[PDB]
Design a protein around this ligand. Structure first.
Ligand SMILES: *[C@@H]1O[C@H](CO[C@@H]2O[C@@H](C)[C@@H](O)[C@@H](O)[C@@H]2O)[C@@H](O[C@@H]2O[C@H](CO)[C@@H](O)[C@H](O)[C@H]2NC(C)=O)[C@H](O)[C@H]1NC(C)=O
Ligand SMILES: [Ca+2]
Ligand SMILES: [Ca+2]
Lengths: 65, 4, 299, 298, 4
């Protein structure tokens, strides 16, 4: 509730929102790119790894507590 | 194909 | 190492900055993802395309402006529905409707009645695939009200030589009469009139029993030939059999050209032969049977 | 505040980099999309009103065929299944990779989209089906030609297969919002179209029945979800055109999730979009393969 | 799924 403590609480709710938001764009992009395989010359070969996103998600919450 |  | 409480004030705003920056980049990326989407709706482009111009047959089409050989839809007068065919259009306004094609042995011609009736193989916009258009269609195309038709056969051996054989008033009957083959006469051709039979030299009737004018179409599962046995069956094909044949375009595809009585399953010659141009043990490399209105063939 | 500001910096910097990877991956795709994919499908000679007539006319190989349901419209390409259960099956919907996008507007869903077939490698004909939606006008017309049964097939990322038959299948024209009707169910995948979501009770399970529903697309709401929020439409969430109710038990035209398993925090609108068929794997599994094919009844 |  101090001057800065309020700032740090907002940066938690914000990175938590951005951590889940990104976790999605990462999936959206994976699907969107694959869906180009039937249109375009080729589809950039790739592989998603939600592990890093989940690892950080559990990692954040630990500190948010 | 002349058959016998 | 655990900075001073005075660091917090600054360090805390450093996050707010990169956090907000991150956000912006995400908004712009979602945008790009949106544009990439409008880029991935089309299907793959198919090379094989069918032309728009249609007529009662390839010649009609060729007379409606058609200029290049390709896949077109035609619909003879008495035809219930239209159907895809291959048209050969030369530089003189001639449009041939091809109904038989051999060129590599890709397609198996050991087909049943219905298959030879409905057709099999594949039509390619560049006449590079083997196929049998179909007796029914062949019948329709060659029997349109008052329009004499002509048939041209084109042979090509495994050396590079190519010969032709023509027939005036070509025609194929309805199923009711087993798609019987008939024609007015041999119109000439350095390939030889193998439809008139061939004196194979194995008997006095070889000529008569290996002639095709008037023969009905035959298949293993539907014998209509003039022989107690089953020509179509022993020679593994579908054709206007007699007892049996001087010409055999829907015959077994023999790579090379030369095959022996041993190559065959039942001794008799069952390859793509044409007696008036090669030995009964020489199967052609390329075969093609096409028709066009007679009046169109050199007056 | 101690080790707190520490972690918050680490994650933000990680994301920053991850944004750089995606920006990078999307730039490449954009370039590869400056030219199309291609096929070369020589058309088979035998043709018919549909696959059942073709198989009967002697077309015994599964590949692309040209059919003409009727003198009305011009012949069009379709993939015929001549091997599954006595063949004669006309594929109207296919899923197997994630190559084609199914989250399209009403028109694309009406005209059809995707690849009907691709080259069998070294072959001149296309003996493999692609991912495609035949087209609503076309599907409706085929069903109204006479009794039509519907065969739905599927497979998980491990190789297990289950089918969902329907003795009666019909789709009304566009004027009737391509209203769907199925009956005479049987099979091993569970009757998700008629009975509804197997793992739901009463009222809940009912709002997930497709039978009788109208077709909806993210740009044309005809769902059984009466709401005011312009964002609460079964097609906007769940992504893809379907006979959504409120919202579904089956999402055949959903997003193709690689791997199968997926969760609410992966989904775009947190809903259960994805090649789903609850009655078998639940709401959070995206079939590896999903297809819908028709054939005259008898 | 459903929208209870
Ligand atoms: C119908 O479903 C709703 C939505 O809840 C979800 O789906 C359920 C099947 C179950 O899996 C829940 O965990 C999901 O969240 C149920 O919602 C009820 O809502 C009331 C009012 O907010 C709440 O008090 C209840 O606890 C919720 N459900 C219960 C009793 O746990 C609803 O109850 C379901 N009813 C039917 C027809 O089964
Ligand atoms: Ca006989
Ligand atoms: Ca609605």
């Amino acid at each position: 509730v101090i001057e800065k403590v309020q700032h740090i609480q907002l940066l938690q709710k914000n990175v938590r929102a951005q951590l889940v938001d990104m976790k999605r764009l990462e999936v959206d992009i994976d699907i969107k790119i694959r869906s180009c395989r039937g249109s375009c010359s080729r589809a950039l070969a790739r592989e998603v790894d939600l592990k890093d996103y989940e690892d950080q998600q559990k990692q954040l919450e630990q500190v948010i507590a | 194909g002349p058959r016998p | 190492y655990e900075a001073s409480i005075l660091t917090h004030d600054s360090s805390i705003r450093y996050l707010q900055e990169i956090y907000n920056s991150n956000n912006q980049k995400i908004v712009n990326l979602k945008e790009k993802v949106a544009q990439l989407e409008a880029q991935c709706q089309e299907p793959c482009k198919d090379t094989v395309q069918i032309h728009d111009i249609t007529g009662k047959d390839c010649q009609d089409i060729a007379n409606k402006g058609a200029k290049q050989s390709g896949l077109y839809f035609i619909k003879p007068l008495k035809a219930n529905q239209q159907f895809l065919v291959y048209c050969e259009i030369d530089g003189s306004g001639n449009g041939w409707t091809v109904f038989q094609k051999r060129l590599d042995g890709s397609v198996d011609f050991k087909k049943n009645w219905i298959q030879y009736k409905e057709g099999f193989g594949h039509l390619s916009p560049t006449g590079t695939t083997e196929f049998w258009l179909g007796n029914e269609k062949i019948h329709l195309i060659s029997t349109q009200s008052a329009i004499p038709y002509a048939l041209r056969v084109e042979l090509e051996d495994w050396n590079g030589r190519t010969s032709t054989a023509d027939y005036a008033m070509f025609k194929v009957g309805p199923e009711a009469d087993k798609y019987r083959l008939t024609y007015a006469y041999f119109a000439g051709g350095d390939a030889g009139d193998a439809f008139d039979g061939f004196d194979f030299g194995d008997d006095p009737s070889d000529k008569f029993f290996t002639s095709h004018n008037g023969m009905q179409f035959s298949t293993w599962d539907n014998d209509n030939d003039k022989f107690e046995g089953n020509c179509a069956e022993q020679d593994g094909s579908g054709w206007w059999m007699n007892k049996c044949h001087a010409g055999h375009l829907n015959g077994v595809y023999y790579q090379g050209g030369t095959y022996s009585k041993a190559s065959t399953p039942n001794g008799y010659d069952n390859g793509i032969i044409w007696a008036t141009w090669k030995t009964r043990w020489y199967s052609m490399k390329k075969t093609t049977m096409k028709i066009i209105p007679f009046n169109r063939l050199t007056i | 505040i101690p080790t707190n500001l520490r972690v918050l910096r680490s994650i933000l910097e990680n994301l920053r980099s991850k944004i750089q990877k995606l920006e990078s991956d999307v730039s490449a795709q954009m370039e590869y999309c400056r030219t199309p994919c291609t096929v070369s499908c020589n058309i088979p000679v035998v043709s018919g009103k549909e696959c059942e007539e073709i198989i009967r006319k002697g077309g015994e190989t599964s590949e692309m065929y040209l059919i003409q349901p009727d003198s009305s419209v011009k012949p069009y390409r379709v993939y015929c299944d001549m091997n599954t259960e006595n063949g004669g099956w006309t594929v109207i919907q296919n899923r197997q990779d994630g190559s084609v996008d199914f989250g399209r507007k009403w028109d694309p869903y009406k005209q059809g989209f995707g690849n009907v077939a691709t080259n069998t490698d070294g072959k001149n004909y296309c003996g493999l089906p692609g991912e495609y939606w035949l087209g609503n006008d076309k599907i409706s017309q085929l069903t109204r030609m006479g009794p039509t049964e519907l065969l739905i097939e599927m497979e998980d990322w491990k190789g297990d297969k289950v089918k969902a038959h329907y003795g009666g299948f019909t789709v009304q024209n566009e004027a009737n919002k391509y209203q769907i009707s199925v009956n005479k169910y049987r099979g091993t995948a569970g009757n998700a179209l008629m009975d509804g979501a197997s793992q739901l009770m009463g009222e809940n399970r009912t709002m997930t029945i497709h039978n009788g529903m109208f077709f909806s697309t993210y740009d044309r709401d005809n769902d059984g979800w009466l709401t005011s929020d312009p964002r609460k439409q079964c097609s906007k969430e769940d992504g893809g055109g379907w006979w959504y109710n409120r919202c579904h038990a089956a999402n055949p035209n959903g997003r193709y999730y690689w791997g199968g398993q997926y969760t609410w925090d992966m989904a775009k609108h947190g809903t259960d979009d994805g090649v789903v068929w609850m009655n078998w794997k639940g709401s959070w599994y995206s079939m590896r393969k999903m297809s819908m094919k028709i054939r005259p009844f008898f | 799924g459903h929208r209870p």
